[PDB]
Structures are given as structure tokens and as C-alpha cells.
């Protein structure tokens, strides 16, 4: 699985348009995609681990990786939550598998979001990575709607080697991220 259309599309479309625009002196200096980290805060399931393990089964299906489990750092009483209880799932993915996942995310997932006038362009965090939340999980192709007990969303974090924001935008723009302009 080293082909991956989006990966290629980065090298034979995006990298060049990138140098043409910002005028990079060095081969390395042009923005690379490292690390799409996906994360579910699941604290909706606290004392029931049965609800958790179904959700990690879900991610693996869309990501192709079994996710980690994140555990309560501190006890915070106001909503339940003693320390060390399972909070949610988190999977890091890179290198191919980030590509193959981002590919699906652009062509299939986001089109399947109700409304979706496009991705808010202020979520660039200013050192030039981007973050986005999703409401439900069935916007991915791997989910059959008869397998859902309850709809739980996630947090997607995408990290760029772009030092700045405006650059990181370009990269993702040219990759085909539907921004709301």
C-alpha cells in the first residue's frame, strides 16, 4: 500500500505549487504532513467500559489502527471523574496510513456531513497546524449505520512542518481541504 493517490498528489502537484508560491530555497523547508492524530473524549462512558471498547472497535475500522486509551489525569468531581478512569480513545497515525485516511476524509467523510458549507479557516493554531471536530462517526464509509449504538464524535489534529499558518493553509488547500474561505 505505498501508492495512495493523495500521497502522490502531494509530490507531483502540491510540493511544486508550494515552491512556486512561497519560494523555498531548500528541499526540506517546504511543508510536509506529519501525524494526523485522531482523538475521542468519551467520558460519556465512565463506569461502563463496555461502551468504550465498542468505540475503539469503531476507530480501528476507519483508521486501520487500534487506538490507545486515555486515562483521567486528575480527579475532578463536578462531573463524576475520579483519577485514572478511562476517559476516551486516542490513535496516532502517520506515513501512508495518515495518507490513506486523509484521502477518504476528503472524498467521502466531509461530503457526508449535513450542511457542510466547508471547513472553518481559523482553526490554524498559529504555529501552523490545523484541528477539527466531528459530530457523528457514520460519515465514514466503513460505518454501516446498523452497527451504531450511539453516535459519538471526535477531535482530529493535523500537524504540519510548516513554521507558519498561511503556509500550512496552502498545503491543505492544495491538498483539497474544502475551506469556507
Amino acid at each position: 500500500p505505498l501508492d495512495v493517490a493523495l500521497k502522490r498528489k502531494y509530490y507531483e502537484e502540491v510540493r511544486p505549487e508550494l515552491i512556486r508560491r512561497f519560494g523555498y530555497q531548500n528541499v526540506w523547508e517546504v511543508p510536509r504532513l506529519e501525524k494526523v492524530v485522531i482523538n475521542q473524549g468519551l467520558g460519556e462512558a465512565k463506569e461502563d467500559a463496555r461502551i468504550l471498547e465498542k468505540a475503539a472497535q469503531e476507530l480501528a475500522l476507519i483508521t486501520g489502527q487500534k487506538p490507545a486509551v486515555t486515562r483521567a489525569k486528575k480527579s475532578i468531581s463536578n462531573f463524576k471523574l475520579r483519577k485514572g478512569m478511562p476517559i476516551g480513545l486516542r490513535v496516532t497515525l502517520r506515513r501512508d496510513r495518515m495518507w490513506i485516511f486523509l484521502e477518504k476524509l476528503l472524498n467521502v467523510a466531509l461530503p457526508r456531513i449535513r450542511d457542510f458549507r466547508g471547513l472553518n479557516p481559523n482553526s490554524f493554531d498559529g504555529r501552523g497546524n490545523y484541528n477539527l471536530g466531528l459530530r457523528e462517526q457514520l460519515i465514514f464509509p466503513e460505518i454501516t449505520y446498523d452497527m451504531v449504538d450511539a453516535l459519538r464524535g471526535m477531535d482530529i489534529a493535523v500537524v504540519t512542518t510548516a513554521e507558519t499558518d498561511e503556509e500550512a493553509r496552502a498545503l491543505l488547500e492544495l491538498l483539497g481541504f474544502p475551506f469556507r474561505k
Binding site: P1, D3, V4, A5, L6, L61, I62, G64, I100, E103, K104, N107, V108, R112, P141, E142
Partner: peptide, 11 residues
């Protein structure tokens, strides 16, 4: 392109 578990998916 595809490349995912559960091959031949409908959208």
C-alpha cells in the same frame, strides 16, 4: 484509491 478495511464500500 480506497485502501481501507472492508473492501467494496457504498457511499
Amino acid at each position: 484509491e480506497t485502501y481501507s478495511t472492508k473492501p467494496e464500500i457504498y457511499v
